[PDB]
Design an enzyme around this catalytic site. Structure first.
Site, PDB file in Angstrom:
ATOM      1  N   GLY A 162      62.765 -24.593  12.242  1.00 15.93           N
ATOM      2  CA  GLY A 162      61.527 -24.072  12.785  1.00 15.93           C
ATOM      3  C   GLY A 162      61.752 -22.770  13.520  1.00 15.93           C
ATOM      4  O   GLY A 162      61.357 -22.628  14.681  1.00 15.93           O
ATOM      5  N   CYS A 209      60.397 -19.793  12.967  1.00 19.77           N
ATOM      6  CA  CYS A 209      59.077 -19.243  13.261  1.00 19.77           C
ATOM      7  C   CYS A 209      57.996 -20.304  13.091  1.00 19.77           C
ATOM      8  O   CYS A 209      57.295 -20.621  14.056  1.00 19.77           O
ATOM      9  CB  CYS A 209      58.817 -18.020  12.368  1.00 19.77           C
ATOM     10  N   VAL A 214      58.224 -24.265   7.052  1.00 13.16           N
ATOM     11  CA  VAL A 214      58.376 -23.609   5.755  1.00 13.16           C
ATOM     12  C   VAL A 214      58.534 -24.681   4.685  1.00 13.16           C
ATOM     13  O   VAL A 214      59.465 -25.493   4.740  1.00 13.16           O
ATOM     14  CB  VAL A 214      59.568 -22.640   5.735  1.00 13.16           C
ATOM     15  N   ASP A 272      66.221  -8.682  16.559  1.00 12.19           N
ATOM     16  CA  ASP A 272      66.926  -9.947  16.373  1.00 12.19           C
ATOM     17  C   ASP A 272      67.779  -9.960  15.107  1.00 12.19           C
ATOM     18  O   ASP A 272      67.666 -10.872  14.280  1.00 12.19           O
ATOM     19  CB  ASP A 272      65.933 -11.108  16.341  1.00 12.19           C
TER      20      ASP A 272
END
Ligand SMILES: *CCC(=O)N1CCC[C@@H](n2nc(-c3cnc4[nH]ccc4c3)c3c(N)ncnc32)C1
Length: 286
Positions: free
Chosen positions: A29, A31, A34, A143
Site C-alpha cells: 500500500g 500509495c 493496486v 522519493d
C-alpha cells in the site's frame, strides 16, 4: 480529460469497471490498493489502482497527486503510462500498464549484486525522467529509491510513484544532506540516485547497521559519502559517476544537464544491452 476509456497501445476501447476480471492484489500500500486485472474484451492484463471515495483523506490526496503527474508525462518514455480511468459513484479506478518488478524485489530475487550493464540502462532512464520532470514541469520527485524503479519483461525501465512530488518528506535512508540540514533541494534526487546505485551494485545498503531513523540521518551527515567498492571490476566511468552523484555539498553537486554528458551516460545511451533476457532469468528463480 476523458474517463471510461482504455487505450491499450494505439487502440481505444469503451470500457466500464465491470468489463475487467480481478486476478488478485499486488501486495503493498505504497500509495493505494493496486489490483491485477484482465480486460475481458481483449484479454490484456493490466494494473488498476482503486481509490475509494470514503477512504483516508491523506491517502487520496497523494493518489490524485500521483495521477496528475502521470497524465502530464504521457510523452516521456521513462515514466509509467496511464491507460485510462473509470469514475463510479463510490470509487475511482486508475488503469496503468502492468510492469514486471521493481528494482528492490529484483535485488531480493538476485540475492546479490546487480550487473553494471543493467544499472547503466537504469541510470540513463532515471536521469532522463527526472530531467524531464524538472524541465517540462518544474516537478521534483523527492522519493527516488529502488522500490520506485520498475522493470518489465520487454526490458523497459520506468520511474513511478509521484505521490509526494513537489512543484518547487521521503524515506530517511535516501534523504540528501541538504534535505536533512537545510542552509535548495533541486539537486537532492541526484544524491538519492547515487545511494540507490551503490545499493544495487553491491546488494548491501550503505547504512544497514542503524536501529532508528535518526541514526541514519546522523551517519549521512557525519560520515564520508559511501563509495563504490574498487575491487568488483567496476569501470572507471561507473565509479566516477557515483562519486559525482554523492557530492556532500549540494552547491558542488553536478546538474542534470552536466550529468547527462558524463561518459557513463554516453556509453549506455548507445550500447545494446539485453536487459529483457536478463530479467526473465532472474524472475525464474525460487
Ligand atoms: C517493489 C515494487 C512494489 O512492490 N510495488 C508496490 C506494489 C505495487 C507495485 N506496482 N505499482 C504499480 C502502480 C503504480 N502507480 C500507479 N498509479 C495508478 C495505478 C498504479 C499502479 C504497478 C504497475 N503499474 N505495474 C506493476 N507493478 C506495480 C509497486
Amino acid at each position: 480529460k476523458q474517463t471510461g476509456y482504455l487505450t491499450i497501445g494505439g487502440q481505444r476501447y469503451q470500457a466500464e469497471i465491470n468489463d475487467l476480471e480481478n486476478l488478485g492484489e499486488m501486495g503493498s500500500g505504497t500509495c493505494g490498493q493496486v489490483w491485477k486485472m484482465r480486460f475481458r474484451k481483449t484479454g490484456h492484463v493490466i494494473a488498476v489502482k482503486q481509490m475509494r471515495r470514503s477512504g483516508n483523506k491523506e491517502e487520496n490526496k497523494r493518489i490524485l497527486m500521483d495521477l496528475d503527474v502521470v497524465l502530464k508525462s504521457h510523452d516521456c518514455p521513462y515514466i509509467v503510462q496511464c491507460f485510462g480511468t473509470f469514475i463510479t459513484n463510490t470509487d475511482v479506478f486508475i488503469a496503468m500498464e502492468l510492469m514486471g518488478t521493481c528494482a528492490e524485489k529484483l535485488k531480493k530475487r538476485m540475492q546479490g549484486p546487480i550487473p553494471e550493464r543493467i544499472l547503466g540502462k537504469m541510470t540513463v532512464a532515471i536521469v532522463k525522467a527526472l530531467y524531464y520532470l524538472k524541465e517540462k514541469h518544474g516537478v521534483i520527485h523527492r522519493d527516488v529509491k529502488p522500490s520506485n524503479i520498475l522493470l518489465d519483461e520487454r526490458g523497459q525501465i520506468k520511474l513511478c510513484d509521484f505521490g509526494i512530488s513537489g512543484r518547487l518528506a521521503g524515506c530517511a535512508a535516501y534523504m540528501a544532506p541538504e534535505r536533512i540540514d537545510p542552509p535548495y533541494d533541486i539537486r537532492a534526487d541526484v544524491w538519492s540516485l547515487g545511494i540507490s546505485l551503490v545499493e544495487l551494485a553491491t546488494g548491501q545498503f550503505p547504512y544497514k547497521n542503524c536501529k532508528t531513523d535518526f541514526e541514519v540521518l546522523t551517519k549521512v551527515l557525519q560520515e564520508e559519502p559511501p563509495l563504490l567498492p574498487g575491487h568488483m571490476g567496476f569501470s572507471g566511468d561507473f565509479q566516477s559517476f557515483v562519486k559525482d552523484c554523492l557530492t556532500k555539498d549540494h552547491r558542488k553537486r553536478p546538474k542534470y544537464n552536466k550529468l547527462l554528458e558524463h561518459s557513463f551516460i554516453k556509453r549506455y545511451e548507445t550500447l545494446e544491452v539485453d536487459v529483457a533476457s536478463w530479467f526473465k532469468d532472474v524472475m525464474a528463480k525460487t
